[PDB]
């Protein structure tokens, strides 16, 4: 029936680093990747900081010429994907290229490119719109360009489920493998929404922290003084592989992907229900998918965005799903350090969950100085905590009330 | 693996504001293409397209709700509401966890982004709508539909450019087949007819510039074709597990038996001349369905009226079907509707289902002089009544992303 799926390669760009090891080093050290934004003038904006990718060199991956045609979200997605494939040791050949697919998504996609082309249109006229505008801006072009560059001929698609994108991308890619549509998938997400429209759009909704004087303290999930999320950029990609395929080529296996859950809240467009009912159904779906007792869960990488309503909803959802075991597991939000990578959040957080398994350590929730009312679980405040972790869960919730949960397990 | 049937359909297209009106146009060989009226294209090289005419969002949403939502979302919701109504499905506490949605778009909220860009550049960030982000992102058709109807099953959105509608329907069917849902609303929507859209595709020289005869512009496989015609709209299907459908006495249009995907891994905006990726995709879909290629009677082609694209599809069909390529009928309804981009696969799935219901191959209009090698039965000019037990619908998109759906008569 259903085939087993393992993780054999990972890649990342984040506010903490230009690859996985550097990012993870920052995570375990409790380092913030958040700083005043330097690439544009935000004097007129209520939020002037976020998580930028620092010192990205696209020329390690693509020619300058090729890169100029592509929005940053595509460049970031390609970088993460190339890293992951290299990390996997996979060799693409005529014998396997039809069995290797890609599903790299984004929540917002090419907003910066669209903005720049809109500026050209309004100020100069339609003949200043780039000939590469459409292919350089649409969300499926990470999958498109990766497939072209590596020669991948398997299932080729992209999800866009807002802040849940990365999680859904990885889960659905795993389903393709489990049900025999592919043997390998490169999956994850990328995001670069740090332009006027992005900061201004989230600003207009009053969704962002406005702690401009102390950006590194802004993202503080479950803390009583939290005041909205921190906008961040980057990408995560995983090479998912059928177990026997991985074993046959002597691949290094990080972990097994054992469970995937989805649900819809059917509640509100931008706010979760206070009781976290949809998130609870999603996690339960994922645990039953994995054939697990909830007591087997050791670590949860929370969605944990540093919003008042969101953070408390997750606590409620975890208490509902896990009962008294909610007090035995460890749960943390790495968004405390990275900020919120939107569509890429689930991808980078899947990577962190896998590394939590590899290194047997719960990443910290930094800035958790004063836990809010009811936020009385082990939230790994301040410092990384070495502990036994056999099963790790990663949650993402997004606009439209779209939920995703991934369950990873140590592989023996 | 559980069987999946189609129990409801909905549509907005250049030919009509619902399925029956659109299908009437298709069978009559009507063009939905006309000079664009909603903006000033005097300075553009292409000034026509397929618009949705006389859309009344207040049949579906309050004025307040509508003001928050980009047109592509309005179109998607309209098609979705129609399809759910057409299905007769009753959502209850007992089944709401088993009903999901996967409605996608290729480009999404270009018009809304354009309008907000004006506020940003002329006034600054403080004039950006508080609803800008949720009202513009692609997953909001799925989001809003789930909220309005109380659907708590799988909730997601595909964005695979011109293949979106096809992939959305295919992956939704997989959810049902493998037990993740009993019902899914699936398809796509698009409204890219703004300065950025016309200007963007214009800058790439991808559009027909036959401004003097807009209804003759979309001419798939014709020697005088000169690019695609940009169109707007939406399609949605209610997909349902067979026993679930039977239990409530649903009207079943057809069965969805196969879904294939592939990547060309060739070029960003052009397929390979031999259509190798499309061929692999169709073969995958047929194997998924457990069908011999000789069982295929009708193909609703991607058929965009681009030089490279059209010929690649013929080559792919010849490769997959061999001598049977001369027995089947293939047509492009884009000859009449133009190219609905992300919604193309959704409306074309609907047309394939209706081809099965009515036992008729829709025409490829404007096919006056077939190009070299385009010597299959392309149903030139007029609808052709024939036996159709199995119908295939193809979509190919930027990045070389391919999808094929296989539908069969349900007895
Ligand atoms: O990631 C985020 O910042 C947002 C806010 S918390 C979550 C939602 C759940 C339901 C609607 S919005 N997504
Ligand atoms: O739908 C369209 O108009 C375009 C052109 S034909 C198809 C492609 C296949 C491979 C890359 S582009 N998509
Ligand atoms: Mg921080």
UniProtKB/TrEMBL annotation, chain A:
GO cellular component, one term: cytosol
GO MF, one annotated term: metal ion binding
Group of enzyme by EC: transferase
Keyword Oxidoreductase appears in the UniProt entry: no
EC number(s) recorded for this UniProt protein: 2.3.1.179
InterPro entries found in the cross-reference section: 3-oxoacyl-ACP_synth-2 (IPR017568), Beta-ketoacyl_synthase (IPR000794), Ketoacyl_synth_AS (IPR018201), Ketoacyl_synth_C (IPR014031), Ketoacyl_synth_N (IPR014030), PKS_Beta-ketoAc_synthase_dom (IPR020841), Thiolase-like (IPR016039)
Pfam families named in the record: ketoacyl-synt, Ketoacyl-synt_C
Pathway given in the UniProt record: Lipid metabolism; fatty acid biosynthesis
A biological process from GO: fatty acid biosynthetic process
Residues where Mg(2+) 2 binds: 32, 336
Chain sites annotated for binding Mg(2+) 1: 32, 216, 336
Key words of the record: Acyltransferase, Fatty acid biosynthesis, Fatty acid metabolism, Lipid biosynthesis, Lipid metabolism, Metal-binding, Transferase
PROSITE patterns, alphabetized: KS3_1, KS3_2
Catalytic activity: a fatty acyl-[ACP] + malonyl-[ACP] + H(+) = a 3-oxoacyl-[ACP] + holo-[ACP] + CO2; (9Z)-hexadecenoyl-[ACP] + malonyl-[ACP] + H(+) = 3-oxo-(11Z)-octadecenoyl-[ACP] + holo-[ACP] + CO2
Similarity field: Belongs to the thiolase-like superfamily. Beta-ketoacyl-ACP synthases family.
Function: Involved in the type II fatty acid elongation cycle. Catalyzes the elongation of a wide range of acyl-ACP by the addition of two carbons from malonyl-ACP to an acyl acceptor. Can efficiently catalyze the conversion of palmitoleoyl-ACP (cis-hexadec-9-enoyl-ACP) to cis-vaccenoyl-ACP (cis-octadec-11-enoyl-ACP), an essential step in the thermal regulation of fatty acid composition.
Protein name: 3-oxoacyl-[acyl-carrier-protein] synthase 2
Organism: Pseudomonas aeruginosa (strain ATCC 15692 / DSM 22644 / CIP 104116 / JCM 14847 / LMG 12228 / 1C / PRS 101 / PAO1)
């Amino acid at each position: 029936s259903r085939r087993r799926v393992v993780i054999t390669g990972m890649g990342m760009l984040s506010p903490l680093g230009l690859d996985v090891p550097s990012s993870w080093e920052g995570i375990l050290a409790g380092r913030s990747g958040i700083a005043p934004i330097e690439h544009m003038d935000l004097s007129a904006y209520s939020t002037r900081f976020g998580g930028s990718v620092k010192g990205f060199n696209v020329e390690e991956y693509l020619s300058a010429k090729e890169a100029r045609k592509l929005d940053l979200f595509i460049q970031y997605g390609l970088a993460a994907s190339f890293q992951a494939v290299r990390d996997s040791g996979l060799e693409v050949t005529d014998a396997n290229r039809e069995r290797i697919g890609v599903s790299m998504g984004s929540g917002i996609g090419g907003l910066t490119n669209i903005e720049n082309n809109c500026r050209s249109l309004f100020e100069q006229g339609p003949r200043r719109i780039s000939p590469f505008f459409v292919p350089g801006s649409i969300i499926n072009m990470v999958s498109g360009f990766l497939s072209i560059h590596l020669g991948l001929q398997g299932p080729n698609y992209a999800l866009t489920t807002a802040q849940t994108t990365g999680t859904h991308s990885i889960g659905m890619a795993a389903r393709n493998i489990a049900y025999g549509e592919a043997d390998v998938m490169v999956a994850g997400g990328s995001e670069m929404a740090a332009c006027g429209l992005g900061l201004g759009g989230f600003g207009a909704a009053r969704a962002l922290s406005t702690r401009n004087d102390e950006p590194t303290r802004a993202s503080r999930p479950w803390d009583r003084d939290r005041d909205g999320f921190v906008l961040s950029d980057g990408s995560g990609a995983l090479v998912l592989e059928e177990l026997e395929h991985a074993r046959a080529r002597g691949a290094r296996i990080y972990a097994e992907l054992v469970g995937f859950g989805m649900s819809g809240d059917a509640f509100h467009m931008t706010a979760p229900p206070e009781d976290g009912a949809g998130a609870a159904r999603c996690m339960k779906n994922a645990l039953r998918d994995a054939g697990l007792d909830p007591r087997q869960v050791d670590y949860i990488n929370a969605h944990g965005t540093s919003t008042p309503a969101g953070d408390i909803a997750e606590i409620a959802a975890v208490k509902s799903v896990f009962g008294e075991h909610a007090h035995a597991l460890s749960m943390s939000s790495t968004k405390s350090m990275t900020g919120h990578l939107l569509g890429a959040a689930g991808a980078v957080e899947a990577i962190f969950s896998v590394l939590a398994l590899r290194d047997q350590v719960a990443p910290p929730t930094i800035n958790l100085d004063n836990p809010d009312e009811g936020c009385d679980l082990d939230l790994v405040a301040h410092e990384a905590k070495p502990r036994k972790i056999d099963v790790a869960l990663s949650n993402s919730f997004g606009f439209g009330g779209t939920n995703g949960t991934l369950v990873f397990r140590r592989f023996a």
